[PDB]
C-alpha cells in the first residue's frame, strides 16, 4: 500500500526488488515486471569487463575519434587527443554516467551480444542487452529489447559485488566506484540515513523511466541489495526524482 501510493502520487508504475543479505528478508512490488534498464547496464557491464581481464590489463590504453563520441560524453569528450585507459573508462562509465565510455567497453568485450552470453553464463536468463547508447534507453512498452526486472538486477548485481563471480580485489574496484558516483545524490542516497553508505547507478530512458541500482551498508552487519525502477505511460513524460527516495524509505522501513 505504501508502495501503492507513492504510483497515485507520481502517476507511475514501480518495480522494487531489495534482498537484506544478512538475514534473506525481501522486499518486493512488481519485482518481475520488466522495464527499460537504461544507465543501470553499465555496472553489470564493468562487472563483465572486469572478470574478462586482469587488474594490469586495464591500463590499456584505448584510442577514440569524435566519431565515438555520442549525446552525453562528460570524461570522454576532454580525451580524444590522448585515448583513455580501459580503468579511466571504466570509471567514467560508471560515476559519471559517459555514454560514449560504455560504447568503448562494449566494443572491448564483443558488444551487446557477448554481454548478453556472460549474463546467461551468470545464472540470469532476463537482462537483455541489445543495443548500444544512447539508442538502448529507447524501448516502447511491451518490447524486451535492452530491458531487465529488478529481481535480475538486483540478483546480477549481487554476484558481481558481493559474490564468487569476481574475486575480492576486483569487487574492491567495482564497489568503490559505485560508491563514489556523481548521479546518484537525489535517489537512493536521499532516502537512506546519515552514515549509511552507498554503492549506486542511476539510469533515466523514454516513457519517464527513472532506476536506481545500489548496494546499502549500515553502519554493522550485511549489505542489502536494491533495485528501484519506474516509468510512466507517455513517451516524453518526465520523471521524479523525488519518487526514488520515497520508495526507498518505504524498503528500509520494511526491513529495518
Known amino acids: ?13 514501480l518495480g522494487i526488488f531489495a534482498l537484506d543479505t544478512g538475514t534473506n528478508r525481501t522486499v518486493a512490488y512488481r519485482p518481475d515486471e520488466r522495464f527499460a534498464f537504461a544507465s543501470t547496464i553499465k555496472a553489470l557491464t564493468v562487472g563483465v569487463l572486469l572478470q574478462q581481464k586482469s587488474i594490469e590489463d586495464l591500463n590499456q590504453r584505448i584510442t577514440y575519434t569524435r566519431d565515438d563520441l555520442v549525446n552525453y560524453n562528460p570524461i570522454t569528450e576532454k580525451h580524444v587527443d590522448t585515448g583513455m585507459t580501459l580503468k579511466e573508462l571504466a570509471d567514467a562509465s560508471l560515476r559519471y554516467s559517459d555514454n560514449a565510455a560504455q560504447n568503448l567497453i562494449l566494443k572491448q568485450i564483443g558488444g551487446p551480444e557477448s554481454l548478453k552470453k556472460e549474463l546467461r553464463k551468470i545464472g540470469d536468463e532476463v537482462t537483455n542487452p541489445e543495443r548500444f547508447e544512447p539508442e538502448l534507453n529507447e524501448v ?25 563471480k569476481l574475486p575480492s580485489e576486483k569487487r574492491e574496484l567495482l564497489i568503490d566506484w559505485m560508491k563514489r558516483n556523481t548521479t546518484g545524490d537525489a535517489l537512493i542516497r536521499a532516502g ?24 546499502i551498508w549500515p553502519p554493522k552487519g550485511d549489505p542489502v541489495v536494491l533495485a528501484v525502477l519506474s516509468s510512466r505511460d507517455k513517451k516524453d513524460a518526465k520523471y521524479d526524482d523525488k519518487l526514488i527516495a520515497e520508495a526507498t524509505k518505504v524498503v528500509m522501513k520494511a526491513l529495518n
Open 1 to 13: 500500500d505504501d508502495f501503492a501510493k507513492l504510483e497515485e502520487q507520481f502517476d507511475a508504475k
Open 140 to 164: 516502447n512498452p511491451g518490447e524486451t529489447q535492452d530491458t531487465s526486472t529488478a529481481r535480475a538486477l538486483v540478483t546480477s548485481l549481487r554476484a558481481f559485488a558481493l559474490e564468487d
Open 192 to 215: 537512506v540515513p546519515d552514515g549509511w553508505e552507498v554503492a549506486d547507478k542511476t539510469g533515466a530512458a523514454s516513457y519517464g523511466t527513472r532506476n536506481d541500482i545500489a548496494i
